[PDB]
Design a protein around this ligand. Structure first.
Ligand SMILES: OC[C@@H](O)[C@H](O)[C@@H](O)CO
Ligand SMILES: *C(=O)c1ccc(Br)cc1
Ligand SMILES: *C(=O)c1ccc(Br)cc1
Ligand SMILES: *C(=O)c1ccc(Br)cc1
Ligand SMILES: *C(=O)c1ccc(Br)cc1
Lengths: 22, 22, 22, 22
């Protein structure tokens, strides 16, 4: 569950960071 | 342990980054 | 596949962030 | 190696980001 959660969070983080930079 | 550590770190990184942006 | 996707994304995210900072 | 590398990179990314902010 930890690795699954982190994987999802890593994807979320990239998306959010892109939106922040835009 | 590397993968467990990186997973924890990914989650922490997102939390810190959100807090930084706010 | 989720872990593979997240692994690719983690590498991409670092590259993008370094280029943004530079 | 993909997962090992991504794990290393996730740790490096947080270290760099914390240092960048500080
Ligand atoms: O998994 C892809 C999802 O549809 C969203 O995260 C979009 O990419 C957001 O634009
Ligand atoms: C949750 O992501 C998880 C925990 C242990 C093992 Br093994 C696989 C996945
Ligand atoms: C530490 O996260 C770790 C190392 C080797 C294997 Br296999 C699983 C997890
Ligand atoms: C996809 O990355 C993936 C899914 C299940 C298991 Br077990 C390993 C990898
Ligand atoms: C590299 O990280 C790697 C590739 C295949 C398997 Br199985 C474990 C680790």
């Amino acid at each position: 569950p930890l690795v699954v959660a982190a994987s999802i969070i890593a994807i979320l983080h990239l998306i959010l960071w892109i939106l922040d930079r835009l």
